[PDB]
Amino acid sequence: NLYFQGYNEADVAALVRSLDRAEDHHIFAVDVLETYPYLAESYTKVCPRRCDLATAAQKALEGAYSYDLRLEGLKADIALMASNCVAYNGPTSAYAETAAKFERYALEQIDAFVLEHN
Numbered sequence: 001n002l003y004f005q006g007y008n009e010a011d012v013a014a015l016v017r018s019l020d021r022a023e024d025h026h027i028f029a030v031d032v033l034e035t036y037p038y039l040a041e042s043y044t045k046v047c048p049r050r051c052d053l054a055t056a057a058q059k060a061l062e063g064a065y066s067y068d069l070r071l072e073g074l075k076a077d078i079a080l081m082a083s084n085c086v087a088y089n090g091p092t093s094a095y096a097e098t099a100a101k102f103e104r105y106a107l108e109q110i111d112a113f114v115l116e117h118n
């Protein structure tokens, strides 16, 4: 599929929005530094690169993920969200457990979208 015309941006953005779960206490909804702006110095030392679901839904509408055949770019942004949460909060916290659960749920929804759309 060398000439894949890309996934519909609105469709990808609705997929990203559906990854924001109440069972995850919405911890991935918005930038950590929008919620905790004074954490910036401490958080950036550990996590130089950040992402969140509101930023990803915005990037989806700009077409940031549309041209990856298997939405590899979106999967990398989900992995970053999850990884930063494990790294900043520690592997024994309930946050790290929520990050691992969210990641597994998100990759399954991404794969089901790819399979459905194609």
Ligand SMILES: COc1ccc(CCc2nc3cc(-c4c(C)noc4C)ccc3n2C[C@H](C)N2CCOCC2)cc1Cl
Residues within 6 Å of the ligand: 024, 025, 026, 027, 028, 029, 032, 035, 036, 084, 085, 088, 089, 094, 095, 098
């Ligand atoms: C895993 O168990 C929980 C998870 C989260 C909480 C506390 C809430 C929380 N604890 C949070 C921790 C983070 C966070 C931090 C700090 N570093 O990475 C992440 C991700 C980010 C958001 C967090 N949020 C949600 C923030 C307060 N909200 C803003 C308003 O809209 C709803 C969401 C409590 C529990 Cl019991």
